[PDB]
């Protein structure tokens, strides 16, 4: 005959943002040098 | 699925049965509708009707229960409300 009223509640939760990324690239530039440290005719005496 | 009882108006024997019954339901069934159904049916059989069971991760309720037939507890992160009314 005794009806008791009760109130229930569950705990809340917490989320968080995040990200993923594959490997990254970057540019590059090269110029080949053309040095010619060469004389005309060295008179050798080997 | 560790059990922690938060509030009860229930005999110790029924409290233990609630935890063990809900634990079995949670091991066997993945979906709350089925977990709740398992738990409710076992109580109607053993402790007579009319039992009600709510199982979930996020809810509030306001209900009326019969004295000495109320328990609210967690299994891990899942809350189970088990009581008689009607």
Coordinates of N, CA, C and O in Angstrom, one line a residue:
Chain A
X1 N 0.8 -1.2 0.0 CA 0.0 0.0 0.0 C 0.9 1.2 0.0 O 0.4 2.4 -0.2
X2 N 2.2 1.0 0.2 CA 3.1 2.1 0.4 C 3.9 2.3 -0.9 O 4.8 1.6 -1.2
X3 N 3.5 3.4 -1.7 CA 4.2 3.7 -2.9 C 5.1 4.9 -2.7 O 4.7 6.0 -2.4
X4 N 6.4 4.6 -2.9 CA 7.5 5.7 -2.6 C 7.9 6.2 -4.0 O 8.3 5.4 -4.9
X5 N 8.0 7.5 -4.1 CA 8.5 8.1 -5.3 C 10.0 8.4 -5.2 O 10.5 8.8 -4.2
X6 N 10.7 8.0 -6.3 CA 12.1 8.2 -6.3 C 12.5 8.8 -7.7 O 11.9 8.5 -8.7
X7 N 13.6 9.5 -7.7 CA 14.2 10.1 -8.9 C 15.6 9.5 -9.1 O 16.4 9.5 -8.2
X8 N 15.9 9.1 -10.3 CA 17.2 8.5 -10.6 C 17.9 9.4 -11.7 O 17.2 10.1 -12.5
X9 N 19.2 9.3 -11.7 CA 20.0 10.1 -12.6 C 21.3 9.3 -12.9 O 21.9 8.7 -11.9
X10 N 21.7 9.3 -14.1 CA 23.0 8.7 -14.5 C 24.1 9.8 -14.6 O 23.8 10.9 -14.8
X11 N 25.3 9.3 -14.6 CA 26.5 10.2 -14.7 C 26.6 10.7 -16.1 O 26.2 10.0 -17.1
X12 N 27.1 11.9 -16.3 CA 27.4 12.5 -17.6 C 28.8 11.9 -18.1 O 29.5 11.2 -17.4
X13 N 29.1 12.3 -19.3 CA 30.4 11.9 -20.0 C 31.1 13.1 -20.5 O 30.5 14.2 -20.5
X14 N 32.3 12.9 -21.0 CA 33.1 14.0 -21.6 C 33.8 13.5 -22.8 O 34.4 12.4 -22.8
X15 N 33.7 14.3 -23.9 CA 34.4 14.0 -25.2 C 35.5 15.0 -25.4 O 35.7 15.9 -24.7
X16 N 36.3 14.7 -26.5 CA 37.4 15.6 -26.8 C 37.6 15.5 -28.3 O 37.5 14.5 -28.9
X17 N 38.0 16.7 -28.9 CA 38.3 16.7 -30.3 C 39.7 16.1 -30.6 O 40.6 16.2 -29.7
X18 N 39.9 15.6 -31.8 CA 41.3 15.1 -32.2 C 41.3 15.0 -33.7 O 40.3 15.2 -34.4
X19 N 42.5 14.8 -34.2 CA 42.8 14.8 -35.6 C 43.8 13.8 -35.9 O 44.6 13.4 -35.1
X20 N 43.9 13.3 -37.2 CA 44.9 12.5 -37.7 C 45.4 13.1 -39.0 O 44.7 13.8 -39.7
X21 N 46.7 12.7 -39.3 CA 47.3 13.1 -40.6 C 48.4 12.2 -41.0 O 49.2 11.8 -40.2
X22 N 48.3 11.8 -42.3 CA 49.4 11.0 -42.8 C 50.6 11.8 -43.0 O 50.7 13.0 -42.6
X23 N 51.7 11.2 -43.5 CA 53.0 11.9 -43.6 C 52.9 13.1 -44.5 O 52.1 13.1 -45.5
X24 N 53.8 14.0 -44.3 CA 53.7 15.3 -45.0 C 54.9 15.4 -45.9 O 56.0 14.8 -45.7
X25 N 54.7 16.2 -47.0 CA 55.7 16.5 -48.0 C 56.1 17.9 -47.9 O 55.5 18.8 -47.2
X26 N 57.2 18.2 -48.6 CA 57.7 19.6 -48.7 C 58.6 19.7 -49.9 O 59.2 18.7 -50.4
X27 N 58.6 20.9 -50.5 CA 59.3 21.1 -51.8 C 60.8 21.1 -51.5 O 61.3 21.1 -50.4
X28 N 61.6 21.1 -52.7 CA 63.0 21.3 -52.6 C 63.4 21.7 -54.0 O 62.7 21.5 -55.0
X29 N 64.6 22.4 -54.1 CA 65.1 22.9 -55.4 C 66.6 22.7 -55.3 O 67.3 23.0 -54.3
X30 N 67.2 22.3 -56.5 CA 68.6 22.1 -56.6 C 69.0 22.6 -58.0 O 68.3 22.5 -59.0
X31 N 70.2 23.2 -58.1 CA 70.8 23.6 -59.3 C 72.2 23.0 -59.4 O 73.1 23.2 -58.5
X32 N 72.5 22.2 -60.4 CA 73.8 21.6 -60.6 C 74.8 22.6 -61.0 O 74.6 23.4 -61.9
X33 N 76.0 22.6 -60.3 CA 77.0 23.5 -60.6 C 77.9 22.9 -61.7 O 78.1 21.7 -61.8
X34 N 78.5 23.8 -62.5 CA 79.4 23.4 -63.6 C 80.7 24.1 -63.4 O 81.1 25.0 -64.2
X35 N 81.5 23.7 -62.4 CA 82.8 24.3 -62.2 C 83.8 23.6 -63.2 O 83.8 22.4 -63.5
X36 N 84.7 24.4 -63.7 CA 85.7 24.0 -64.7 C 87.0 24.5 -64.2 O 87.6 25.4 -64.8
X37 N 87.6 24.1 -63.1 CA 88.9 24.6 -62.6 C 90.1 24.0 -63.4 O 90.9 23.3 -62.8
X38 N 90.1 24.3 -64.7 CA 91.0 23.6 -65.6 C 91.8 24.7 -66.3 O 91.2 25.6 -66.9
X39 N 93.1 24.6 -66.3 CA 94.0 25.5 -67.0 C 94.1 25.0 -68.5 O 93.5 24.0 -68.9
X40 N 94.9 25.7 -69.3 CA 94.9 25.3 -70.7 C 96.0 24.3 -70.9 O 95.7 23.1 -71.3
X41 N 97.2 24.6 -70.6 CA 98.3 23.6 -70.8 C 99.4 23.8 -69.8 O 100.3 24.6 -69.9
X42 N 99.4 23.0 -68.7 CA 100.4 23.1 -67.7 C 101.6 22.3 -68.2 O 101.5 21.0 -68.4
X43 N 102.8 22.9 -68.3 CA 104.0 22.1 -68.8 C 104.5 21.3 -67.6 O 105.2 21.7 -66.8
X44 N 104.0 20.0 -67.7 CA 104.4 19.0 -66.6 C 105.8 18.6 -66.9 O 106.4 18.6 -68.0
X45 N 106.5 18.1 -65.8 CA 107.8 17.5 -65.9 C 107.8 16.2 -65.1 O 108.7 15.8 -64.4
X46 N 106.7 15.4 -65.2 CA 106.6 14.2 -64.4 C 107.7 13.3 -64.7 O 108.5 12.9 -63.8
Chain B
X1 N 32.4 -4.7 -15.8 CA 31.1 -5.0 -15.3 C 31.1 -5.1 -13.8 O 30.2 -5.6 -13.2
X2 N 32.1 -4.4 -13.1 CA 32.1 -4.4 -11.7 C 30.8 -3.8 -11.2 O 30.5 -2.6 -11.6
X3 N 30.2 -4.4 -10.1 CA 28.9 -3.9 -9.6 C 29.1 -3.0 -8.4 O 29.8 -3.3 -7.4
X4 N 28.4 -1.8 -8.4 CA 28.4 -0.9 -7.3 C 26.9 -0.5 -7.1 O 26.3 0.0 -8.0
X5 N 26.4 -0.8 -6.0 CA 25.0 -0.4 -5.6 C 25.0 1.0 -5.0 O 25.8 1.3 -4.1
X6 N 24.2 1.9 -5.6 CA 24.1 3.3 -5.2 C 23.0 3.6 -4.3 O 23.1 4.3 -3.3
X7 N 21.9 3.0 -4.5 CA 20.7 3.2 -3.7 C 19.8 2.0 -3.8 O 19.7 1.4 -4.9
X8 N 19.2 1.6 -2.7 CA 18.3 0.5 -2.7 C 17.3 0.6 -1.6 O 17.6 1.2 -0.5
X9 N 16.1 0.2 -1.8 CA 15.1 -0.1 -0.8 C 14.6 -1.5 -1.1 O 13.6 -1.7 -1.8
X10 N 15.3 -2.5 -0.6 CA 15.2 -3.9 -1.0 C 15.9 -4.7 0.0 O 17.0 -4.4 0.5
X11 N 15.4 -6.0 0.2 CA 16.2 -6.9 1.1 C 17.5 -7.2 0.5 O 17.8 -7.2 -0.7
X12 N 18.5 -7.7 1.4 CA 19.8 -8.0 0.9 C 19.7 -9.2 -0.1 O 20.5 -9.2 -1.1
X13 N 18.9 -10.1 0.1 CA 18.8 -11.2 -0.8 C 18.4 -10.8 -2.2 O 18.9 -11.2 -3.3
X14 N 17.3 -9.9 -2.3 CA 16.9 -9.4 -3.6 C 18.0 -8.5 -4.2 O 18.1 -8.5 -5.5
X15 N 18.7 -7.7 -3.4 CA 19.8 -6.9 -3.9 C 20.8 -7.7 -4.6 O 21.3 -7.4 -5.7
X16 N 21.3 -8.8 -4.0 CA 22.3 -9.7 -4.6 C 21.7 -10.3 -5.9 O 22.5 -10.5 -6.8
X17 N 20.5 -10.8 -5.9 CA 19.9 -11.4 -7.0 C 19.9 -10.4 -8.2 O 20.1 -10.7 -9.3
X18 N 19.6 -9.1 -7.9 CA 19.5 -8.1 -8.9 C 20.9 -7.9 -9.6 O 21.0 -7.8 -10.8
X19 N 22.0 -7.8 -8.8 CA 23.3 -7.7 -9.3 C 23.7 -8.9 -10.2 O 24.2 -8.8 -11.3
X20 N 23.5 -10.1 -9.7 CA 23.9 -11.3 -10.4 C 23.0 -11.5 -11.7 O 23.5 -11.9 -12.7
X21 N 21.7 -11.2 -11.6 CA 20.8 -11.3 -12.7 C 21.2 -10.3 -13.8 O 21.3 -10.7 -14.9
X22 N 21.4 -9.0 -13.4 CA 21.8 -8.0 -14.3 C 23.2 -8.3 -14.9 O 23.5 -8.0 -16.1
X23 N 24.1 -8.9 -14.1 CA 25.4 -9.2 -14.5 C 25.3 -10.3 -15.6 O 25.9 -10.2 -16.7
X24 N 24.5 -11.3 -15.4 CA 24.3 -12.4 -16.4 C 23.7 -11.8 -17.7 O 24.1 -12.2 -18.8
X25 N 22.7 -10.9 -17.5 CA 22.1 -10.2 -18.7 C 23.1 -9.5 -19.5 O 23.0 -9.4 -20.7
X26 N 23.9 -8.7 -18.8 CA 25.0 -7.9 -19.4 C 26.0 -8.7 -20.1 O 26.5 -8.2 -21.1
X27 N 26.3 -9.9 -19.6 CA 27.3 -10.7 -20.2 C 26.7 -11.3 -21.5 O 27.4 -11.5 -22.5
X28 N 25.5 -11.7 -21.5 CA 24.8 -12.4 -22.6 C 24.3 -11.5 -23.7 O 24.4 -11.9 -24.9
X29 N 23.8 -10.3 -23.3 CA 23.1 -9.5 -24.3 C 23.8 -8.2 -24.5 O 24.3 -7.6 -23.5
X30 N 24.0 -7.8 -25.8 CA 24.6 -6.5 -26.1 C 23.7 -5.3 -26.1 O 24.3 -4.2 -26.0
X31 N 22.5 -5.4 -26.4 CA 21.5 -4.3 -26.6 C 20.7 -4.1 -25.3 O 20.2 -5.1 -24.8
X32 N 20.6 -2.9 -24.9 CA 19.9 -2.6 -23.6 C 18.5 -3.2 -23.6 O 18.1 -3.7 -22.5
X33 N 17.7 -3.1 -24.6 CA 16.4 -3.7 -24.7 C 16.3 -5.1 -24.3 O 15.3 -5.6 -23.7
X34 N 17.3 -5.9 -24.7 CA 17.4 -7.3 -24.4 C 17.9 -7.5 -23.0 O 17.4 -8.5 -22.3
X35 N 18.8 -6.7 -22.5 CA 19.4 -6.8 -21.1 C 18.2 -6.6 -20.2 O 18.0 -7.3 -19.2
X36 N 17.5 -5.5 -20.4 CA 16.3 -5.1 -19.5 C 15.3 -6.2 -19.5 O 14.7 -6.5 -18.5
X37 N 15.0 -6.8 -20.7 CA 14.0 -7.8 -20.8 C 14.4 -9.1 -20.1 O 13.6 -9.7 -19.3
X38 N 15.7 -9.4 -20.1 CA 16.2 -10.6 -19.3 C 16.0 -10.4 -17.9 O 15.5 -11.3 -17.1
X39 N 16.4 -9.2 -17.4 CA 16.3 -8.9 -16.0 C 14.9 -9.0 -15.4 O 14.5 -9.6 -14.5
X40 N 14.0 -8.2 -16.1 CA 12.6 -8.1 -15.8 C 12.0 -9.5 -15.7 O 11.3 -9.8 -14.7
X41 N 12.1 -10.4 -16.7 CA 11.5 -11.6 -16.7 C 11.9 -12.5 -15.5 O 11.1 -13.2 -14.9
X42 N 13.2 -12.5 -15.2 CA 13.7 -13.3 -14.1 C 13.0 -13.0 -12.8 O 12.6 -13.8 -12.0
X43 N 12.8 -11.7 -12.5 CA 12.1 -11.2 -11.3 C 10.7 -11.6 -11.3 O 10.1 -12.1 -10.3
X44 N 9.9 -11.5 -12.4 CA 8.5 -11.8 -12.5 C 8.4 -13.3 -12.1 O 7.4 -13.7 -11.5
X45 N 9.3 -14.1 -12.5 CA 9.3 -15.6 -12.2 C 9.5 -15.8 -10.8 O 8.8 -16.6 -10.1
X46 N 10.6 -15.3 -10.2 CA 11.0 -15.6 -8.9 C 10.3 -14.8 -7.8 O 10.1 -15.3 -6.7
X47 N 10.0 -13.5 -8.1 CA 9.6 -12.6 -7.0 C 8.2 -12.0 -7.3 O 7.8 -11.1 -6.6
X48 N 7.5 -12.6 -8.3 CA 6.1 -12.4 -8.8 C 6.1 -11.0 -9.6 O 7.0 -10.1 -9.3
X49 N 5.2 -10.9 -10.5 CA 5.0 -9.6 -11.1 C 4.5 -8.5 -10.2 O 4.0 -8.8 -9.1
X50 N 4.6 -7.2 -10.6 CA 5.0 -6.7 -11.9 C 6.3 -5.9 -11.8 O 6.3 -4.9 -11.2
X51 N 7.3 -6.4 -12.4 CA 8.6 -5.8 -12.4 C 8.8 -5.0 -13.7 O 8.3 -5.3 -14.7
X52 N 9.7 -4.0 -13.6 CA 10.1 -3.1 -14.6 C 11.6 -2.9 -14.6 O 12.2 -2.9 -13.5
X53 N 12.3 -2.9 -15.7 CA 13.7 -2.7 -15.7 C 14.1 -1.8 -16.8 O 13.7 -1.9 -18.0
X54 N 15.0 -0.8 -16.5 CA 15.6 0.2 -17.4 C 17.1 0.0 -17.3 O 17.6 0.1 -16.2
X55 N 17.8 -0.1 -18.4 CA 19.2 -0.3 -18.5 C 19.7 0.8 -19.5 O 19.3 0.9 -20.6
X56 N 20.8 1.5 -19.1 CA 21.3 2.5 -20.0 C 22.5 3.2 -19.5 O 22.8 3.2 -18.4
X57 N 23.1 4.0 -20.4 CA 24.2 4.9 -20.1 C 23.9 6.3 -19.8 O 24.7 7.0 -19.2
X58 N 22.7 6.8 -20.3 CA 22.4 8.2 -20.1 C 20.9 8.4 -20.0 O 20.1 8.3 -21.0
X59 N 20.4 8.6 -18.8 CA 19.0 8.8 -18.5 C 18.8 9.3 -17.1 O 19.6 9.1 -16.2
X60 N 17.6 10.0 -17.0 CA 17.0 10.3 -15.7 C 15.6 9.8 -15.7 O 15.0 9.6 -16.7
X61 N 15.1 9.5 -14.5 CA 13.8 9.0 -14.3 C 13.1 9.5 -13.1 O 13.8 9.8 -12.1
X62 N 11.8 9.5 -13.1 CA 11.0 9.7 -11.9 C 9.9 8.7 -11.9 O 9.1 8.7 -12.8
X63 N 10.0 7.7 -10.9 CA 9.1 6.6 -10.9 C 8.5 6.4 -9.5 O 9.0 7.0 -8.6
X64 N 7.5 5.6 -9.4 CA 6.9 5.2 -8.1 C 7.1 3.7 -7.9 O 6.7 2.9 -8.8
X65 N 7.7 3.3 -6.8 CA 7.9 1.9 -6.6 C 7.2 1.4 -5.3 O 6.9 2.2 -4.4
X66 N 7.0 0.1 -5.2 CA 6.6 -0.5 -4.0 C 7.7 -0.6 -3.0 O 8.9 -0.9 -3.4
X67 N 7.4 -0.3 -1.8 CA 8.4 -0.3 -0.7 C 9.1 -1.7 -0.7 O 8.4 -2.7 -0.9
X68 N 10.4 -1.7 -0.4 CA 11.2 -2.9 -0.3 C 11.4 -3.6 -1.6 O 12.0 -4.7 -1.7
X69 N 11.1 -2.9 -2.7 CA 11.3 -3.5 -4.1 C 11.9 -2.5 -5.1 O 11.4 -2.2 -6.2
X70 N 13.1 -1.9 -4.7 CA 13.7 -0.9 -5.5 C 15.2 -1.0 -5.4 O 15.8 -1.1 -4.3
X71 N 15.9 -1.0 -6.5 CA 17.4 -0.9 -6.5 C 17.8 -0.1 -7.7 O 17.3 -0.3 -8.9
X72 N 18.9 0.6 -7.5 CA 19.5 1.3 -8.6 C 21.0 1.1 -8.4 O 21.6 1.4 -7.4
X73 N 21.7 0.5 -9.5 CA 23.1 0.2 -9.4 C 23.7 0.3 -10.7 O 23.0 0.3 -11.8
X74 N 25.1 0.3 -10.8 CA 25.8 0.2 -12.0 C 26.5 -1.1 -12.2 O 26.9 -1.7 -11.2
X75 N 26.7 -1.5 -13.5 CA 27.7 -2.5 -13.9 C 28.6 -1.8 -14.8 O 28.3 -1.5 -15.9
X76 N 29.8 -1.5 -14.3 CA 30.7 -0.7 -15.0 C 30.1 0.7 -15.2 O 29.8 1.4 -14.2
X77 N 30.0 1.1 -16.4 CA 29.4 2.4 -16.8 C 27.9 2.3 -17.1 O 27.4 3.4 -17.5
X78 N 27.3 1.2 -17.0 CA 25.9 1.1 -17.4 C 25.0 1.0 -16.1 O 25.3 0.2 -15.2
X79 N 24.0 1.9 -16.0 CA 23.1 2.0 -14.9 C 21.9 1.1 -15.1 O 21.4 1.0 -16.3
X80 N 21.4 0.4 -14.1 CA 20.3 -0.4 -14.1 C 19.3 0.0 -13.0 O 19.7 0.1 -11.8
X81 N 18.1 0.2 -13.3 CA 17.0 0.6 -12.4 C 16.0 -0.6 -12.4 O 15.5 -1.0 -13.5
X82 N 15.8 -1.2 -11.3 CA 15.0 -2.4 -11.1 C 14.0 -2.2 -10.0 O 14.5 -2.1 -8.9
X83 N 12.7 -2.3 -10.3 CA 11.7 -2.1 -9.2 C 10.4 -2.8 -9.6 O 10.2 -3.1 -10.7
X84 N 9.6 -3.0 -8.5 CA 8.3 -3.4 -8.7 C 7.3 -2.3 -8.6 O 7.5 -1.4 -7.7
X85 N 6.3 -2.3 -9.4 CA 5.1 -1.4 -9.4 C 4.0 -2.0 -10.2 O 4.1 -2.2 -11.4
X86 N 2.9 -2.2 -9.6 CA 1.7 -2.9 -10.2 C 1.9 -4.4 -10.0 O 2.9 -5.1 -9.4

